[model samples]
Target: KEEPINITPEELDASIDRVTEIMIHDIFSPPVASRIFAYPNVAAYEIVAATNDNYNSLAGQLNGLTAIPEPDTTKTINYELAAVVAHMELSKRLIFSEDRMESLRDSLYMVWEGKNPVLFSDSKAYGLQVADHIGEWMNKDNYAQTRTMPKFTVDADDPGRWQPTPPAYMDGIEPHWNKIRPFVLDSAAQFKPVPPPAYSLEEDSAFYKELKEVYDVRNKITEEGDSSEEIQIARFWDCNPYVSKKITPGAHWMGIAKIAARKTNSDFAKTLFAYTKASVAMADAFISCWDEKYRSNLIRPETVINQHIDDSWKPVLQTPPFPEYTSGHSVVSGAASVVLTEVFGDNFSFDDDTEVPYGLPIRSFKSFKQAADEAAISRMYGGIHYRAAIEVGVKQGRDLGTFVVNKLHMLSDKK
Candidate 1:
């Protein structure tokens, strides 16, 4: 077992106080609609904002908050956030009442202050003053605008073009996410990847070769040994909304970020900065990739191969309910790796146990980029993407990641 690191100051240390008490503030918040745009999309933004706000050490009374001049903030705060986000998302999916969720929502504050939300009224009122005000862009950001994106009517004329794979998830699976909001990039379209190969079926065609590539993987998908490694890798990174509990690619990287914070012994400010920047990069990367996804609207390898190569073919993973082109896993991993490398430096290696709960064993890597590269290739191994999407997706993702790094001005001093 690891030694317990301290976060609370001496006064609050070993106190019998840190506990949550819920006051359901007037009424329970109910779901808005059956097909509500306000629910998940906007809720994701608001929940992340809450995570950032809760952990920011500098946001509160930095004078007496902790014992050390530079407390073990990065460890405490970052884990708290990953915990909060994971819990909140789960609670959200179960669709808990708004009043009920308030219990889950601000639980961190109770621990942070070593008091209940009600009793910590001084800091509850005062602590969040800076944190709440930090992300003005988020407060004004409208995820509902994603609903305004051009509705996908499901093209009937062509088999080669992109088509909806959603049974329950129509409207193109956050097709308008590109326009939702960007953290650092100029706009969603600023760093678009080159278009995917044109639809074709000739043996020598670029598109056909990729289609065949996916087909061959599916052919080997059922076997063992080296083939099992590919399947393991696929399932390892498969954060399929339906299969897993809605843990997206961004969240996986966030988990990795938390591990880095723990290993590196990050303080509060460093921890908060790490998570916020990584998340901002992730949110923006989704926007950029989705912008490319719908713009290109390329057919999934499953669809293309099924049509021309083998009608019996299907990917090892369930194709997500969206258009395919640039891979979400690849792009976000690229962006996440970039931001992570910036925060922790290029040499921080760790065993990724992020998917252990999903039944995949831990895998070791030399660098964040290596994990990201493995994640990108896992898509092809899963038979959902062509090599072009993985290759080009990582390229564009780096562009997006690099943008986030350069744009955010921060302290370089260990001083």
Candidate 2:
């Protein structure tokens, strides 16, 4: 019999950190990054679930996810090692650089094998087998088909439709993301947000009022200077993929979950359970948000203000290329917050250092809901989204998050 090798929650945290670093290096877009964060965790959780009686398998739970290959019960396997291997292996497949993941894996392998040679070999073999199985399931998610789809059709003459924003003036990113299969969602459009205020240039119209508000918020913030609270909040949550080290909203939430796990001193199984649920919620949240993004195809405040009100005005943060309505940050943050709250309980305070590496100061929150609201409003302060998108987008996410929590009974009642 092999001696038991204890794996700490910090080990899983390190693997996730490595994935985020590589995702930034590769500059993965937010929606795509959400997918990358999700699958690996799912794969890792499956291995954990297989070994632990306290957890339930997600095979029959997630859409189209059938039973994963079971480990040979007779073999000597350290399931913790197997889970980490599956996480890194699937991550290597989903990301760009093989060498990057390989190097990290090798480092861990050397350390793990030193502890127990035969057990490491057996666990690694089983993990690779499970990674391949999950990879097969991952390949059928329609992401490949979306790559071949046509670019977003822009209508320059239509005042209300989305047009490529300044700087990059890039084509809309992921126009067909809604078509991708969701982990828990029935359809991308399952939680359809109300259509944005009807596009009207009339001074008294609801659309025009919202447009004016965007300009007004920018003017107020600009006059208040760089030290304003709104500006600080805006920059702290400004998770643009092209900026800095590419901290997307998905990665930000992952960091928060990690912090939560550490603060609670969660064991290995609890850590995996919290992370898997949060990641799945964020992934499906992106799909749900992107569905409304392309459907509404609403114009951004920067474009509308430049053309109608003031060509000289600049937003607090660089506007990302995409439609205006139904902010992605709002949806993902909202969904993740709800999942986290359910897992950890309400009023669970924590200091968020997710943006600290990017030179922003740490922000503390009394609860996940508090953080979610700030993330939603930060979009408006950045001048990238209007009030409707910020307000309604969050509700859409909360609704979806509640659905996900109810659908998946991850931990056993006895806990």
Candidate 3:
């Protein structure tokens, strides 16, 4: 018989942090990065939930997710070890740097096996089984179909439509993201925001009012210079994968959840639940947000201001190449906030140092809602999104988040 060893929340956090590091190295876009974050967490959560009577499996709760493979009962296995192994395995499959994960796995393997060779072997075997099962489920999500889809065709002649933004001017990313299967939402369009105000430049039009607000906000923020709080807010929440080496929006939220786990002294089981719920919400949020993004095909304020108002105008931050209606940052942040609030409490406060490695200082928030609201407004301060998109996107995400929270029942009442 093998003695059970202690598992800590810090171990799981290291796996997640390693994945984020590789994702940054691989340069995954925000939407794709959300996917990478999601599947691995679900793999780990399923294993953990399967072993724990206090939790429920997501078999019927998540769309298209069936019962995972049951571990072989004859073997002496540490399910917590299996859960972490499954997490690292699935993450290794999704990201480009397999060697990075292998190194991490090797280190952990030595430690666990040194403690008890029989238990380590059995747990690792079970973890791989679950990883393969989850990986199969992950493949049917239409991500490959999206790869074969045509690139976004910009209509420059249409003044109201999204044109390639400055700097990279890369073609709009993930125009067919709606086709990808959502983890919790009924469909990508389930919570699509109301269409953006009809494109117009008339001075008194609602569209122009919002557009002018974007222009004016940029001018005021820039005039205050980089030291301005608004400018710093914009930079802090940038999370732009393309512009500079930084975390995806989903990665940032995961980091927050990780910190919350440490602060609350959560064990492995609770940590898995929190990460799984939040990551899935962020994934579905991107799908729902992208559906509206392509449908609206709204132009960025930077393009509009340069063409109509001033020849030399530019926003304080680089505009990501995508339709502008609903901000991805705002939607994902709102969804994360909802999940975080439910898991942690409405008024739980924490310091967010997720951006510290990238040269940003720690910013404290009284609640996840406060953080989410700030993330939404930061897009406008950066001059990438219209005010309408910011407001509606957050609402869209909250509605979607509520649906996810209502659907999943991971924690048992007896807890």
TM-score each candidate: 0.74, 0.98, 0.98
Each candidate: RMSD: 9.2, 1.4, 1.3
Pairwise lDDT winner, candidates 2 and 3: 3
The deviation in Å at residue 349 for candidate 3 is: 0.6
Model 2 C-alpha lDDT per residue in residues 324-383, reported as the tens digit of each score: 879999999999999999999999899999888877899999999999999999998999
How many clashes (backbone N, Cα, C below 3 Å) per candidate?
2, 0, 0
Off by over 4 Å in 1: 1-101, 105-119, 128-136, 148-150, 166-171, 223-227, 244-246, 412-415
Backbone clashes in model 1, listed as residue pairs: 73-268, 74-267
Clash pairs, candidate 2, are: none
Cα-based lDDT for every prediction = 0.59, 0.90, 0.91
10 residues in a row with least lDDT, candidate 2: 238-247
Candidate 2 residue spans exceeding 4 A from truth: 1-3, 413-415
Error of 2 at 114 (Å): 2.3
Model 1 has how many clashing residue pairs? 2
Which residue pairs of candidate 3 clash? none
What is the lDDT for 262 in model 1?
68
Q: Output the lDDT of residue 11, model 3.
A: 82
**Overall local distance difference test of candidate 3:** 0.91
